[PDB]
Design a protein around this ligand. Structure first.
Ligand SMILES: N[C@@H](Cc1onc(O)c1Br)C(=O)O
Ligand SMILES: N[C@@H](Cc1onc(O)c1Br)C(=O)O
Lengths: 258, 258
């Protein structure tokens, strides 16, 4: 039957076409993951319906209720058959859902307003003039919360108690904050999103320093789903064919505005 | 039996004494509402236990689940017997819980960093250079969300879509934001909290313009609770005895630091 795909509005993975109100179904969206879903579906031989995750979250488990939210939750509770989005492969998630090998590699990075005197995470941790934060949910926030590494521990300690809050609801908000804070706010996010934004007008942001870690995004399916095998092979095939690199260039650099 | 009082950490209504770790029970807290609870209990002849609302919220109903959160929720679901805090009497709340006549009068107001060229709500609505917001929950946010008054409608329209978010988690955060934004952020909050903060170091904030509305805080009890009658009479008695005004002066001006 028609496969239900859960995904999330995150540029340039999935975005509403400017003229979406005049369109219907899958045609309403565009982006790297929209193109990827089409390729995966073709190689696995299934028809699908793109749906945007109800709560706009990636996926975490509430420590008290033990309930999973976000795209991970939609898979865990059977609300969706597959997640095709910039969903980071992590230990906690790997335990409850299946993941294809990575379709994109990335790492946590620093985004600054051009001119900000910051070149690394160490730089940020050793000062207070420039505030810094992460998304209010997801693997980056979790990276800092769980890190036992001195420098990252120091940063988390500062972030968790910083006032006003240094956390944002969406990537768009973090970017807006960096752009409007006159260099007094730096944003910690995944290298992939950082690199995309660096090529977007008004071209006033920059990725600085090396990535804090090395990981990847994977296509997710409910644990034990018979669709997992084919999907994983499709990702490997698409990568080996150079299609994934082609898609990355298409949505990141081919039409960079900077 | 011992009455369970739900309240909230909001200065100067209820605050943790500096040395709370060395104290136990009700002795751990201090403030206007702590003193008020003692007076109400004495006049109604009951023993009580102060408890801080689990979710740190005042009280709203989720439009989807219809579940009440905050102090209102604790009363509605029988987790607490009475709420003694700066809980605003509103139509939606009055329908599900009982309220004593007001023990304090107030209205929505504007807090600015001294020197900010803003004298009214109209001023704020007609410009964009200075951002402004409210608590991310409670009667003030709701006032703007539901207002059909042109000026407030205009302000809500701007606030709801402003990026980054102009909403804060606690009063303390809104104050910190006003103080650290060099006049580029104004905070909308209740006159009572505004007046208290204006007398606190570093004495860099000011209440401007007249209040946007006129309302009051009431002591709340589960609907139909036999404790409601006595509590209401106690509030009226304490007010007529001048005790409420005495308490206001004690926690607002007697030890003002400005
Ligand atoms: N890919 C992450 C989400 C995320 O993590 N950090 C960010 O800035 C974003 Br967007 C995840 O799967 O949680
Ligand atoms: N008293 C209000 C809470 C509140 O509403 N606006 C604020 O700034 C605060 Br604190 C309520 O009962 O919701």
């Amino acid at each position: 039957k028609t496969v239900v795909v859960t995904t999330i509005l995150e540029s340039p993975y999935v975005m509403m076409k400017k003229n979406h109100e005049m369109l219907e179904g899958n045609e309403r969206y565009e982006g790297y993951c929209v193109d990827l879903a089409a390729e995966i579906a073709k190689h696995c031989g299934f028809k699908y319906k793109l749906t945007i995750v109800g709560d706009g979250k990636y996926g975490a488990r509430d420590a008290d209720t033990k309930i999973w939210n976000g795209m991970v939750g939609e898979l865990v509770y059977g609300k969706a058959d597959i997640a095709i989005a910039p969903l980071t492969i992590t230990l906690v998630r790997e335990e409850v859902i299946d993941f294809s090998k990575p379709f994109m590699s990335l790492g946590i990075s620093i985004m600054i307003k051009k001119g900000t005197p910051i070149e690394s995470a160490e730089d940020l941790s050793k000062q207070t003039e420039i505030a810094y934060g992460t998304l209010d949910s997801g693997s980056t926030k979790e990276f800092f919360r769980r890190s036992k590494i001195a420098v990252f521990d120091k940063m988390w300690t500062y972030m968790r108690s910083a006032e006003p809050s240094v956390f944002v609801r969406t990537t768009a908000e973090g970017v807006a904050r960096v752009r409007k804070s006159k260099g007094k706010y730096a944003y910690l996010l995944e290298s992939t999103m950082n690199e995309y934004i660096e090529q977007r007008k008004p071209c006033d942001t920059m990725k600085v320093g090396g990535n804090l870690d090395s990981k990847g995004y994977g296509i997710a399916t409910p644990k034990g789903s018979s669709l997992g095998n084919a999907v994983n092979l499709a990702v490997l095939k698409l990568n080996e064919q150079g299609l994934l690199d082609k898609l990355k260039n298409k949505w990141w650099y081919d039409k960079g505005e900077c």
